[PDB]
């Protein structure tokens, strides 16, 4: 079933940008864009939780052509308009410090993508990944632990679960389990897809819980800035009791670094019932119910 590598770097699909929209509001930190591509012309199909490659134009500092960068698909299999004609991405412009030898450094593929014009042609590969896939069971529980652009696989899950047009298009997937997003960003303007996320929770208060960790607006109990791991610690017992369900899947996605705090919190919960989390977790991985994509 799972489509993989319908296009490869040696002969990528040439898509066209339909749209490029700002996801970070005024007063937020950084630039994250929602970019939709036209898939007509070829046969790139994909499902939720997968990634695609984008090959940027240009050569590196060595004169060699730039390679593909991997990006979590931010749309469901059907695309944002539920026509099966497009695919979307959620791209943060990488930028950073003086210790890089220059000044402020801007990432090649991410600057290219966040500044790209509708009408522009992009080299696209994939889809890739069997690690962040959603169970076909409509009564599965789905815990989603996301920071920043790690919201992208979560968006594909939630849109498939809860969008009116998605439910109408997917007769076999009528989600009636429980899902819980814990989403961590620096500010409220940085809550990507905030409006749609909150409308899902208003529409399905019993099937979807939304929790934010906003570091510039909230403090954890020890006085530090609030991060996703603090929220997982706060709800460690609850999250552990859902994780004990044979049908619960947990997904972690975002830049690398949150996993160590998530594990310490869940470890302390499981220890209360004589269970060593790290061992339970290894069994969850083998079972295909512990999903991780950090980068
Ligand atoms: C499976 C997967 C999925 C991904 N999904 C997404 C996504 O949905 N959205 C998204 O925005 N990104 C995503 N990324 C990351 C994305 O692929 C690119 O790595 C990222 O966009 C930066 O690429 P670039 O071309 O902009 O940067 P480059 O020009 O390749 O710059 C990156 C390099 O500069 C260095 N560097 C980076 N940050 C720092 C820092 N703080 N300090 C010092 N040196 C640094 C490192 O050498 C790094 O290799 C994903 C990565 C993977 C592996």
Short mmCIF file of N, CA, C and O and ligand atoms in Angstrom, two decimals, residues 51 69-72 90-92 94 96-97 100 107-111 149 152 293 295, ligand 1:
data_model
loop_
_atom_site.label_atom_id
_atom_site.label_comp_id
_atom_site.label_asym_id
_atom_site.label_seq_id
_atom_site.Cartn_x
_atom_site.Cartn_y
_atom_site.Cartn_z
N UNK A 51 7.39 11.93 4.30
CA UNK A 51 8.20 13.09 3.94
C UNK A 51 8.43 13.12 2.43
O UNK A 51 8.30 12.10 1.75
N UNK A 69 16.93 18.19 0.69
CA UNK A 69 16.61 18.29 2.10
C UNK A 69 15.24 17.64 2.31
O UNK A 69 14.39 17.69 1.42
N UNK A 70 15.06 17.00 3.46
CA UNK A 70 13.83 16.29 3.77
C UNK A 70 12.85 17.15 4.53
O UNK A 70 13.24 17.92 5.42
N UNK A 71 11.58 17.09 4.14
CA UNK A 71 10.55 17.89 4.78
C UNK A 71 9.31 17.05 5.03
O UNK A 71 8.84 16.33 4.14
N UNK A 72 8.81 17.09 6.26
CA UNK A 72 7.57 16.40 6.60
C UNK A 72 6.44 16.95 5.75
O UNK A 72 6.26 18.16 5.66
N UNK A 90 5.64 22.55 5.52
CA UNK A 90 5.69 23.51 6.62
C UNK A 90 7.16 23.80 6.92
O UNK A 90 7.84 23.01 7.56
N UNK A 91 7.67 24.89 6.35
CA UNK A 91 9.10 25.14 6.29
C UNK A 91 9.53 26.37 7.09
O UNK A 91 9.13 27.50 6.80
N UNK A 92 10.40 26.15 8.06
CA UNK A 92 11.01 27.23 8.81
C UNK A 92 12.33 27.64 8.14
O UNK A 92 13.14 26.78 7.79
N UNK A 94 15.86 28.44 8.24
CA UNK A 94 16.99 28.27 9.14
C UNK A 94 17.88 29.51 9.08
O UNK A 94 18.25 29.98 8.00
N UNK A 96 21.00 31.58 11.76
CA UNK A 96 21.74 31.51 13.01
C UNK A 96 23.00 32.37 13.10
O UNK A 96 23.26 33.19 12.22
N UNK A 97 23.87 31.96 14.02
CA UNK A 97 24.89 32.78 14.66
C UNK A 97 26.07 33.19 13.76
O UNK A 97 26.14 32.82 12.58
N UNK A 100 30.00 30.60 12.40
CA UNK A 100 29.67 29.86 11.19
C UNK A 100 30.56 30.27 10.02
O UNK A 100 30.62 29.64 8.96
N UNK A 107 19.98 29.23 5.88
CA UNK A 107 20.02 27.91 5.26
C UNK A 107 19.61 27.91 3.80
O UNK A 107 18.68 28.61 3.41
N UNK A 108 20.27 27.08 2.99
CA UNK A 108 20.04 27.09 1.55
C UNK A 108 18.61 26.69 1.15
O UNK A 108 17.85 27.53 0.66
N UNK A 109 18.23 25.45 1.42
CA UNK A 109 16.92 24.96 0.98
C UNK A 109 15.75 25.68 1.64
O UNK A 109 14.73 25.91 1.00
N UNK A 110 15.91 26.04 2.91
CA UNK A 110 14.82 26.65 3.67
C UNK A 110 14.55 28.11 3.31
O UNK A 110 13.41 28.56 3.34
N UNK A 111 15.61 28.86 3.01
CA UNK A 111 15.47 30.25 2.55
C UNK A 111 14.86 30.22 1.16
O UNK A 111 13.95 30.99 0.85
N UNK A 149 8.12 22.97 13.67
CA UNK A 149 7.73 22.42 12.37
C UNK A 149 7.40 20.92 12.46
O UNK A 149 6.83 20.35 11.53
N UNK A 152 3.91 19.35 11.47
CA UNK A 152 3.54 18.95 10.11
C UNK A 152 2.92 17.55 9.96
O UNK A 152 1.87 17.41 9.35
N UNK A 293 10.47 11.09 14.92
CA UNK A 293 11.17 11.78 13.85
C UNK A 293 11.65 13.14 14.34
O UNK A 293 10.93 14.13 14.27
N UNK A 295 15.10 15.91 14.33
CA UNK A 295 16.09 16.29 13.32
C UNK A 295 16.88 17.54 13.69
O UNK A 295 17.81 17.89 12.94
C1 LIG B 1 12.89 13.71 8.18
C2 LIG B 1 13.14 15.21 8.26
C3 LIG B 1 12.11 16.03 8.21
C4 LIG B 1 12.27 17.42 8.28
N1 LIG B 1 11.20 18.19 8.24
C5 LIG B 1 11.30 19.51 8.26
C6 LIG B 1 10.07 20.38 8.23
O1 LIG B 1 8.92 19.97 8.14
N2 LIG B 1 10.30 21.75 8.27
C7 LIG B 1 11.55 22.32 8.36
O2 LIG B 1 11.69 23.54 8.42
N3 LIG B 1 12.63 21.47 8.43
C8 LIG B 1 12.57 20.13 8.37
N4 LIG B 1 13.69 19.37 8.48
C9 LIG B 1 14.80 19.92 8.41
C10 LIG B 1 15.11 20.25 6.96
O3 LIG B 1 15.36 19.07 6.23
C11 LIG B 1 16.43 21.00 6.70
O4 LIG B 1 17.47 20.41 7.54
C12 LIG B 1 16.35 22.43 7.28
O5 LIG B 1 15.24 23.03 6.60
C13 LIG B 1 17.54 23.24 7.09
O6 LIG B 1 18.01 23.07 5.72
P1 LIG B 1 18.72 24.29 4.98
O7 LIG B 1 18.97 23.85 3.65
O8 LIG B 1 17.85 25.44 5.24
O9 LIG B 1 20.09 24.43 5.82
P2 LIG B 1 21.94 24.03 5.57
O10 LIG B 1 22.07 25.14 4.58
O11 LIG B 1 21.96 22.62 5.13
O12 LIG B 1 22.28 24.41 6.94
C14 LIG B 1 22.27 23.37 7.85
C15 LIG B 1 23.65 23.11 8.31
O13 LIG B 1 24.22 24.28 8.99
C16 LIG B 1 24.48 23.90 10.35
N5 LIG B 1 23.56 24.50 11.41
C17 LIG B 1 22.17 24.46 11.50
N6 LIG B 1 21.67 25.04 12.58
C18 LIG B 1 22.79 25.50 13.30
C19 LIG B 1 22.93 26.23 14.58
N7 LIG B 1 21.95 26.64 15.43
N8 LIG B 1 24.18 26.52 14.99
C20 LIG B 1 25.21 26.13 14.20
N9 LIG B 1 25.22 25.47 13.01
C21 LIG B 1 23.95 25.17 12.61
C22 LIG B 1 24.74 22.38 10.27
O14 LIG B 1 26.06 22.09 9.73
C23 LIG B 1 23.59 21.95 9.34
O15 LIG B 1 23.97 20.75 8.68
C24 LIG B 1 13.56 17.99 8.40
C25 LIG B 1 14.65 17.09 8.44
C26 LIG B 1 14.47 15.75 8.36
C27 LIG B 1 15.73 14.89 8.42
#
